[PDB]
């Protein structure tokens, strides 16, 4: 029964080297190409290349040429993908797959048996507390009824950040969004609350942000625009 | 040449037939073998169809595929909840005079378990505190949409913006609809130089927008 088994999750700091592995079971390791496939967070599957363990032949996708090294050892039936210098942009899910199908007497053409995948997380960021900015409501008493006001919590590392409104007194109509991870390796998120427009003059709205990794606690009053 | 285009999203209710399209070139889909993959939560890509239109062993009869010209397509009849996930076409591309494998961008298939819900879009301009700190961030919050995929595009006046855009994946809300946010980083000078900036959200082939102005 054919199986490819990949090595476990990796959490690395940028610049560090890493070799991940795919060990194969149930057929002659030398005789078939092994393919590699990357999936970036929120994106589709992308082909990296193929490696032939029998004679070390290789084909790299143009974008992967020079960025990564496919290898194998035939002494252990293990295919490898190596980076000497991990970059944050290498952060992804990596699959190994056999190129096979055995549809004819010779050759191969479909990636038939797959590994379960290896997650690789690379970061260059240092711990940093957020800057918090008020998201001013479009403002006064309208018979579109409600107003949306909030807080932008920008440029922090690592997760998580907690957000309250009015020291936890206000939970009705609060939506704190999952954070975005920027190319800088820092995170930002937003929390917004929907309130009656008639409350804008009378009620004070304050978001309470806590980033414990940095010992950052900020209370930001969100007044209406003027 | 080395590009297989699929529609981002597809959906149907249980028991329906759906079709997923894949568009290629003379260097791949037209003459070379096309393959189809299923990608479900928690599991590796799974071969459905090989060499244009053969079912991989163990694949149910309700999966089928074909191709005409530079287009290929996958049909799933008797849609069932467990079919929900990502489907990819793939082909051999010979633009370099050798065997390169290309995946299409993939299509998210939602098996409809609740009514379709258009997204709520809220767009906030840069705060004056941030502008005083010499930065500028447009914040576009997208919520209560089902199926759970949108496309976000920003415009500067009427013109498209590549640079400075950061967008999240959709995430499940407690109501089982979806949420996402997109961010546009500018200088204060860029923000002030245009008449307006817009957040355009496409969901289920339907496009809306919100616009903000420094004035």
């Amino acid at each position: 029964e054919i199986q490819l088994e990949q090595s476990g999750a990796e959490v690395k700091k940028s610049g560090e080297s890493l070799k991940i592995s795919c060990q194969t079971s149930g057929y002659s390791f030398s005789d078939y190409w092994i393919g590699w496939v990357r999936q970036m967070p929120g994106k589709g599957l992308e082909w990296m290349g193929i490696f032939y363990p029998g004679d070390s032949d290789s084909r790299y996708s143009p974008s992967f040429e020079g960025q990564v090294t496919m290898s194998a050892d035939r002494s252990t039936n293990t295919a490898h993908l190596q980076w000497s210098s991990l970059k944050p942009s290498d952060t992804a899910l990596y699959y190994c797959a056999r190129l096979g199908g055995d549809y004819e007497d010779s050759g191969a053409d479909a990636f038939d048996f797959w590994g379960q995948g290896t997650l690789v997380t690379v970061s260059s960021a240092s711990t940093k507390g957020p800057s918090v900015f008020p998201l001013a409501p479009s403002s006064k008493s309208t018979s579109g009824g409600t107003a949306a006001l909030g807080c932008l919590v920008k440029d922090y590392f690592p997760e998580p950040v907690t957000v309250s409104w009015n020291s936890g007194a206000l939970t009705s109509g609060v939506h704190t969004f999952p954070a975005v991870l920027q190319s800088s390796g820092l995170y930002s998120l937003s929390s917004v609350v929907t309130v009656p427009s008639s409350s804008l003059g009378t009620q004070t709205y304050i978001c309470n942000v806590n980033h414990k990794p940095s010992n950052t606690k900020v209370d930001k009053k969100v007044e209406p625009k003027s | 040449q080395s590009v297989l285009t699929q529609p981002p999203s597809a959906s149907g209710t249980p028991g329906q037939r759906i079709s997923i399209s894949c568009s290629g070139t003379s260097s791949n889909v037209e003459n070379n073998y096309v393959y189809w993959y299923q990608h479900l939560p928690g599991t590796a890509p799974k071969l459905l169809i090989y060499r244009n239109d053969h079912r991989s062993s163990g694949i149910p009869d309700r999966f089928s595929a074909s191709k005409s010209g530079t287009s290929a397509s996958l049909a799933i009849s008797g849609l069932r909840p467990e079919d929900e996930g990502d489907y990819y076409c793939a082909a051999w591309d010979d633009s370099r005079g050798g065997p390169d494998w290309v995946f299409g961008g993939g299509t998210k298939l939602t098996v409809l378990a609740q009514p379709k819900a258009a997204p709520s879009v809220t767009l906030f301009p840069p705060s004056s505190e941030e502008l005083q700190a010499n930065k500028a961030t447009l914040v576009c919050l997208i919520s209560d949409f089902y199926p759970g995929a949108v496309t976000v595009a920003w415009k500067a006046d009427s013109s498209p913006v590549k640079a400075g855009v950061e967008t999240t994946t959709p995430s499940k809300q407690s109501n089982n609809k979806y949420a996402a946010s997109s961010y546009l980083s500018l200088t204060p000078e860029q923000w002030k130089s245009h008449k307006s900036y817009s957040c355009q959200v496409t969901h289920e082939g339907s496009t809306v927008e919100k616009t903000v102005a420094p004035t």
């Binding site: 190409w33 549809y103 050759g107 191969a108 | 070379n32 010979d94 050798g98 065997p99």
Partner: peptide, 16 residues
């Protein structure tokens, strides 16, 4: 062996 890659009908690389 299975080094040969069949890209389409009648067409293959690594056929050596």
């Amino acid at each position: 062996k299975r080094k040969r890659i069949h890209i389409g009908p009648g067409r293959a690389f690594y056929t050596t």
